[PDB]
Design a protein around this ligand. Structure first.
Ligand SMILES: CC(C)(C)NC(=O)[C@@H]1C[C@@H]2CCCC[C@@H]2CN1C[C@@H](O)[C@H](Cc1ccccc1)NC(=O)[C@H](CC(N)=O)NC(=O)c1ccc2ccccc2n1
Ligand SMILES: CC(C)(C)NC(=O)[C@@H]1C[C@@H]2CCCC[C@@H]2CN1C[C@@H](O)[C@H](Cc1ccccc1)NC(=O)[C@H](CC(N)=O)NC(=O)c1ccc2ccccc2n1
Ligand SMILES: [Cl-]
Ligand SMILES: [Cl-]
Lengths: 99, 99
């Protein structure tokens, strides 16, 4: 699809077997969710942004379906106010900005 | 242009009289700079991000040039780690996210 930006660009994704919504974010390096439970091991990571840093769990090679496509990549989990799909995932579905 | 997302999507912008660079950020509501100086009075404003809330200066009706499109918008000046072009400016140049 072609998405205008008059509203925040959320999309449906499936991760860990659950349907979630997340913000398509061209400014973010990373992909992060609040309250999803993933299997397998994780490693601690800190991510920074406006206002400071977030302590998260990093899970590697996680399948995400976004809203229709299969991506495998890194997923962060921590107490974020919003789920975000960052460039690490969006490059794998060929997302582009156009103007 | 049509911009892929393998690198961070920075663009050249002229804000006030000054050439700067900033991140095209579909996950940001606002346009925020740290390294510009704008004249005159400003209004206090608070913005949120992943880590908490920051105090910024709001300057109204500021000219912004990006990719040859000259627009007039609200520019915030605050302790952001990265200059960001948010959806408020991107909608004015007709930017879309596509996949
Ligand atoms: C933006 C922030 C998330 C705070 N990250 C950083 O500031 C990291 C932190 C790292 C650990 C501590 C020591 C410094 C390194 C490198 N910095 C990068 C920082 O010092 C450096 C500033 C700079 C820019 C241009 C020319 C010279 C210097 N940025 C850079 O070199 C490149 C610029 C680019 N176009 O990619 N940017 C980044 O490295 C950077 C990293 C994460 C980001 C996440 C989201 C959005 C933008 C992000 N930009
Ligand atoms: C989410 C995460 C992966 C941690 N990445 C980032 O946060 C990186 C960090 C980078 C270095 C510092 C400068 C910003 C860049 C780009 N950001 C992405 C960037 O897109 C980021 C994503 C985001 C949105 C909403 C809430 C939190 C976080 N947007 C923002 O930080 C913008 C800033 C603003 N006020 O315009 N925030 C918002 O637009 C915004 C909207 C609604 C909100 C509701 C509650 C609380 C905070 C809310 N913030
Ligand atoms: Cl959700
Ligand atoms: Cl990020």
């Amino acid at each position: 699809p072609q998405i205008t930006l008059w509203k925040r660009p959320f999309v449906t994704v499936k991760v860990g077997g659950q349907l979630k919504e997340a913000l398509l974010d061209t400014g973010a390096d990373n992909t992060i969710f609040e309250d999803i439970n993933l299997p397998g091991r994780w490693k601690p990571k800190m991510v920074g942004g406006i206002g400071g840093f977030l302590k998260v769990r990093e899970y590697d090679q996680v399948p995400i379906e976004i809203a229709g496509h299969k991506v495998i990549g890194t997923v962060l989990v921590g107490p974020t106010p919003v789920n975000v799909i960052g460039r690490d995932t969006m490059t794998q579905i060929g997302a582009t900005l156009n103007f």
